[PDB]
């Protein structure tokens, strides 16, 4: 049982590694793109106000 | 991937920098850490009533 | 098992580091941009009231 | 393992610090702005009632 649990902990490193890469991709690509989306929406609100 | 292990190494070194944590180096496989008198010792000899 | 668990804790620093950078980016960029969005919406409500 | 855990606790201060600044910004900027938004909506309801 301890050996089986050791393998589970050892294999768990893969999920943590891909999670870090997934989070890194979101910060580098998704977040800046969403900022551009919000800016365009902000301008549209002013035009609708006009 | 994506250099995940490289980031961990850099962070660990910087965070815990400035203090000594050298583990002791002791070889337990030597004869000092083993009982002398192997299978031929009188310890393993049969005790007579 | 202890050695495997030590690696998991050591690797977990990467997720915490990117989380701090992600949160820092949100405070520096996303939050001020959302404030501008809310201000424009506030003006539109008054115009619709008019 | 204890040394690795010590680094994790030490690094966790960064997330708490940015959280305090994020919460402080919300109280100073977001909350007063939302109050102005609600007031304008309240006036619009009366006009629609009229």
From TrEMBL, chain B:
Protein's name according to its UniProt entry: Gp54
Span within the parent record: 2 to 50 of 299
Source organism (scientific name): Enterobacteria phage N4 (Bacteriophage N4)
């Amino acid at each position: 049982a301890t050996k089986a649990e050791y393998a589970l902990t050892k294999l768990k490193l893969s999920n943590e590694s891909v999670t870090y890469c997934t989070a890194q991709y979101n910060l580098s690509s998704m977040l800046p793109q969403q900022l551009l989306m919000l800016k365009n929406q902000t301008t549209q609100v002013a035009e609708q106000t006009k | 991937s994506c250099g995940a292990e490289l980031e961990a190494n850099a962070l660990l070194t910087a965070l815990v920098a400035g203090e000594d944590f050298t583990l002791p180096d002791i070889d337990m496989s030597g004869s000092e850490y083993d009982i002398p008198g192997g299978i031929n010792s009188p310890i393993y000899a049969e005790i007579e009533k």
